[PDB]
Amino acid sequence: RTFARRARPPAAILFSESMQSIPLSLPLSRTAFFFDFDGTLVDLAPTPDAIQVPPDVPVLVDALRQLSHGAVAIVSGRGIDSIDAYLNLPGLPVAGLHGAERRDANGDTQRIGFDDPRLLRIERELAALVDRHPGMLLEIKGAALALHFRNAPEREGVARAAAERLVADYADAYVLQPGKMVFEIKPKGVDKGRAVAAFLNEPPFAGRMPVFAGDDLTDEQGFAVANANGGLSIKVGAGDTTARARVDSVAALRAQLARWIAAGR
Amino acid sequence: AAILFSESMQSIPLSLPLSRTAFFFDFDGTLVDLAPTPDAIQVPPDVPVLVDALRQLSHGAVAIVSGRGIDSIDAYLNLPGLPVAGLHGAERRDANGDTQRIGFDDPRLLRIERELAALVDRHPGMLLEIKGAALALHFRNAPEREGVARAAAERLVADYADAYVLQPGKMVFEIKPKGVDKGRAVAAFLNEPPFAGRMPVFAGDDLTDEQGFAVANANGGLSIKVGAGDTTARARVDSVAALRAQLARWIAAG
Numbered sequence A: 001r002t003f004a005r006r007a008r009p010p011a012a013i014l015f016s017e018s019m020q021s022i023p024l025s026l027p028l029s030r031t032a033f034f035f036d037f038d039g040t041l042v043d044l045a046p047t048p049d050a051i052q053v054p055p056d057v058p059v060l061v062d063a064l065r066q067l068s069h070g071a072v073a074i075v076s077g078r079g080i081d082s083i084d085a086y087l088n089l090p091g092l093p094v095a096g097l098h099g100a101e102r103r104d105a106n107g108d109t110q111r112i113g114f115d116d117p118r119l120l121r122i123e124r125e126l127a128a129l130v131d132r133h134p135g136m137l138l139e140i141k142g143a144a145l146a147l148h149f150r151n152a153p154e155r156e157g158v159a160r161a162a163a164e165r166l167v168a169d170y171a172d173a174y175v176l177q178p179g180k181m182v183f184e185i186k187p188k189g190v191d192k193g194r195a196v197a198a199f200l201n202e203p204p205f206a207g208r209m210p211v212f213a214g215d216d217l218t219d220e221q222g223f224a225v226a227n228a229n230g231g232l233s234i235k236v237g238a239g240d241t242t243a244r245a246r247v248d249s250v251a252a253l254r255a256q257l258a259r260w261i262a263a264g265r
Numbered sequence B: 001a002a003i004l005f006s007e008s009m010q011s012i013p014l015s016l017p018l019s020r021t022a023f024f025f026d027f028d029g030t031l032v033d034l035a036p037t038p039d040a041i042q043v044p045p046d047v048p049v050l051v052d053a054l055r056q057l058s059h060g061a062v063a064i065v066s067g068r069g070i071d072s073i074d075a076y077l078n079l080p081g082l083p084v085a086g087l088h089g090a091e092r093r094d095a096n097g098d099t100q101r102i103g104f105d106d107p108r109l110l111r112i113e114r115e116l117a118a119l120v121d122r123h124p125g126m127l128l129e130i131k132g133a134a135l136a137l138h139f140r141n142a143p144e145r146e147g148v149a150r151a152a153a154e155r156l157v158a159d160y161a162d163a164y165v166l167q168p169g170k171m172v173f174e175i176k177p178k179g180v181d182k183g184r185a186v187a188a189f190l191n192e193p194p195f196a197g198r199m200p201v202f203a204g205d206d207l208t209d210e211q212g213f214a215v216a217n218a219n220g221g222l223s224i225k226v227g228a229g230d231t232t233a234r235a236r237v238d239s240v241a242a243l244r245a246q247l248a249r250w251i252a253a254g
């Protein structure tokens, strides 16, 4: 009785399942761009509050946004408000907190897990933990928490055991997200891949070839979704990855975006 | 160090490391309920008890930051040597008991005040309110004189733009010395022992507290808005009583 007629997909480029060379150019108005922030567009700093955002970063993101007609999103472990504080690009689509909050292209923001009483109980136990361990840093991120040990590397074991134990106490609602010198605790059932897939179901992203660039373990789910959709996954820096392409550094990734922009306009 | 709040909304934490936290509280509408007139406020004895307990447990890193003057705060709190920034920062008693004033007795303020006293004497309904080092030109009871009030106030501020700023309000134009606001008072405290180096908490209820929220946030701390309204504060509580309940729990956890 009913059919499922589709329009020919706007994507004009497909990447196969193999390692790939980063293209010289991309048809910017048929491509969707998803970027992690720390360690990807901006260098990782000794603490989250110490990152330095060069002026090139907002200029390049905004030019990509213009030339692609809005199909650029930040998909970060930071909160949306933090990303807004550093780029000040009004109305930029942002998935923050590994997908626990997302602002779509209309500017509507959805959040999950904020004000959850269990997070406050987890937070209180981690606060006591970092009290006993100088050099560890507890970062409170709205609906998520980050247990940093970059300045106490000898405490990686106690950070892991504490975070794994608290997550297990609330395993129905929370999940662990390891990262470089950090363990983050975040609501269950949201991730960077799901956030990318949600963007790709909405204008202006829908039907376009996706690009995803990231540097850490959380980003592998973004690479997975970009690959499943025939797109281009770019790992920044060293490490095993499912990304199809790799660049050495934040500067080298930045340089790729700059070339795509120049080739476009 | 140890505890950082990100730029995001935030829940009120169940506890805080009191010996490593700095606390800054607005007074009216934040620690005590709003009143129709300034002297009609009632300060329950809970307020000085909770403030003093936090002062002891944090080893001195508690300050009041209010538009009220220091002497008024002392009259209601009776807490000896409590650090207090009064009159929006125009007077500030530090942790050593020394009071620093900005613009008090300035010859220029008295000249501005004399010009405005001439203006208000001609135009009934207008009222000149004198607030130590700052002035307020009211026209609530003479609303048809708003343009006269605006031109005169702007002209006088312009004659001393080096040192005075104009701030419009509801049926009023405020003339304040430069560098006088709650954010600057917070910032000054955080450059002094025992506040220096500590994660700040700042609680407030209206627009004059927004700069205090911004300073707490810049330092990775906890800004708390009392009541409804748009704010830059990261956390929110429903009421004066609700905020007091948070302080009470933080103390009891200590």
Ligand SMILES: [Cl-]
Pocket (backbone or CB within 6 Å): A098, A190, A191, A192, A193, A218, A219, A221, A222
């Ligand atoms: Cl993820």
Ligand SMILES: [Mg+2]
Pocket (backbone or CB within 6 Å): A036, A037, A038, A039, A040, A214, A215, A216
């Ligand atoms: Mg990253």
Ligand SMILES: [Mg+2]
Pocket (backbone or CB within 6 Å): B026, B027, B028, B029, B030, B204, B205, B206
């Ligand atoms: Mg107030």
